[PDB]
Amino acid sequence: IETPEQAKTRERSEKIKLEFETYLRRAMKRFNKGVHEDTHKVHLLCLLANGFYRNNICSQPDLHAIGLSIIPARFTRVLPRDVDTYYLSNLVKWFIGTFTVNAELSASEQDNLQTTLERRFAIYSARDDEELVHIFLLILRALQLLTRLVLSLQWLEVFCEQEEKWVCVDCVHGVVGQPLTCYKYATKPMTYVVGIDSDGWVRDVTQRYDPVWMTVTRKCRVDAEWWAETLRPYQSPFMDREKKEDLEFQAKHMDQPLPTAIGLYKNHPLYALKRHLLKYEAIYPETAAILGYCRGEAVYSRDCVHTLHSRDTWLKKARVVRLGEVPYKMVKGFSNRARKARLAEPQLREENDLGLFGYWQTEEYQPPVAVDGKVPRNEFGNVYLFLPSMMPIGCVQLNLPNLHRVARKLDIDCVQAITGFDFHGGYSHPVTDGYIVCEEFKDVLLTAWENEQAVIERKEKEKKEKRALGNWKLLAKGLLIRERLKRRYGARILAASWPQNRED
Amino acid sequence: ERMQILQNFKHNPKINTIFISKVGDTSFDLPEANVLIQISSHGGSRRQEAQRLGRVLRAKKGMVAEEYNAFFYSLVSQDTQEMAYSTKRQRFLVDQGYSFKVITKLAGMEEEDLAFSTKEEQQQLLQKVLAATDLD
Amino acid sequence: SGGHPLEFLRNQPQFQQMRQIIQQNPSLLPALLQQIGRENPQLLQQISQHQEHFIQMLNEP
């Protein structure tokens, strides 16, 4: 009703303010969640360091000697290679009847863990389950047994060469070789399980004990890359042992649980279920055998499911689709007015077909060769330089500012080197880095470019002075001009000068 | 900015006076107007300024009955070479039957207050013009 | 030598208290969390790389 343009401007300002406030809020939320995740990672690292310290204390020779003295002669005469499940069960049964649980004993923080364990040996009483597990670990290490202390963020793992397997031992309930029982009687909800050997090497054994490892835990754990980098310094030198453990884990997890929940099937390379697949993924071939049914949804091979890139991005990734290849998958696109035409006509929303060609349909992009001092160009007159291998043979990319002007002065071909695209401003603006020129004419041109720079280095200060000179001249004239008028001067005239003294 | 100024001239009633340099001949579209005042001359462009005048002024509804519905004024300095330029230029329009009345006295200037009322202000303008040397 | 940004934190009294807490008794864990909840971008950034020096510092008696 009054200044509609002003009302529109006010509405746009309010919209901009709201957008900026939402951006600030989401940035703050991102920062807070990142801080929380890093705090959780640091807490996990602190628990890992505590496990390291406990394992290091358990490696003392005095504790091992005390345990060996306590161990009866019937157990000291059995070689580690002859240790089986029955021997471990008998040792656990003896250990339970030897040390009792007594939390009423005084616990001083000043007393070190080694001193506390020595006191427990002297009194044959355990303050808590942790002390009992530590004492049993010392007893096992007394016989020089290859044993690992396993903590959930506790029990032991004994390596038996008769089967070459890690058997779990829990002295709390007299449990030997029952990972399910250890999982049931473990600590707070299980997300990570780490076994530290006496030598200090750490192994991930969460798969063995957690039956929900492949469905829920896998998606609820820490970053795989960061955890691998953290555990890289402490990787066990026994590469063959690690390979055997990995093979055993794979054999255990090869379609053993067979879950039927739809949500577990979503985003899973193990299963490769129905529509839950991503927008850019397809099934190659489409005749993949059905691996099972989940509420009427067919299971396909993940090796038959592939992510497909577009021909344009195949070229960007230095790959060329084979000539005549049928586009395996047709998807939608998000682009300029070509895409925006879907908004005007709804019937073209699904008509937009983008061919995502597979890796089997693309061989390789072979860059051309410059001939007769001519730089090859694309359909748009430029060169795609997403990768160095994409550079045509006989061409060099030069990051010289104002090089194209010098090339045109020397009549030298100069082609922009497209390296990327900027999506700012709502459009994918191209990004170019340097100019692609013929190598044979490269170096001389460089010199000319340098000469051009030298020209600027010669032709800048001079011109500045020129401006100043003019200013001085102007200033002088100004004074003179004013002085001149001073020499001259230091409505009646206008209204009646020429055409009045005769008319009136 | 040129388009913004044109839109303001077309739509905003507060601004109804636009200063245009030589670019107003053919470099852009001239919005319909009724008063066109020519102060500076090319030097004898008898056809260029005539075409410019034809393009500036268009037919306006409401004043069709009156024989004077569009106003064009040419400010010419007396006893100068601008007189000869104007005389040479208006020959083409006179050949088309267009009349030209010479106005030496403007009625109403005495009552209305205008700039440079005092002669010393005109001296200041002379100083400013002389400061603009032959470079400009 | 292995010049790390954690070297200043190696002898930092607050970080010395942190490493002493992490050494044996994790009872005071949340308090350090609050510290890392206040402002510690350098600790967040530099703890991802070269954990050997960090763990060795944590295990210093």
Side-chain angles (χ1 to χ4, degrees), chain A residues 311 320-326 357 359-363:
Chain A
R311 175 167 295 182
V320 160
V321 199
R322 305 172 185 177
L323 302 181
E325 277 290 344
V326 180
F357 304 91
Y359 182 85
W360 57 97
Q361 298 173 356
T362 69
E363 297 176 358

Side-chain angles (χ1 to χ4, degrees), chain A residues 125-141:
Chain A
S125 300
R127 176 190 61 179
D128 47 67
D129 300 331
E130 303 177 1
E131 293 189 359
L132 198 66
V133 173
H134 288 61
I135 290 179
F136 192 75
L137 176 58
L138 296 175
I139 281 184
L140 288 187
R141 295 185 181 184

Side-chain angles (χ1 to χ4, degrees), chain A residues 219 260-268 271-281 283 294-300 302 305 329:
Chain A
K219 301 181 179 180
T260 333
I262 283 186
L264 306 184
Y265 279 102
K266 178 181 179 180
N267 306 331
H268 232 280
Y271 307 97
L273 220 229
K274 265 300 181 181
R275 57 174 182 177
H276 322 320
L277 306 177
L278 294 185
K279 184 258 188 61
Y280 301 98
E281 303 194 24
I283 304 181
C294 168
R295 304 171 185 170
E297 307 190 26
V299 183
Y300 303 93
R302 175 58 194 180
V305 180
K329 186 179 184 180

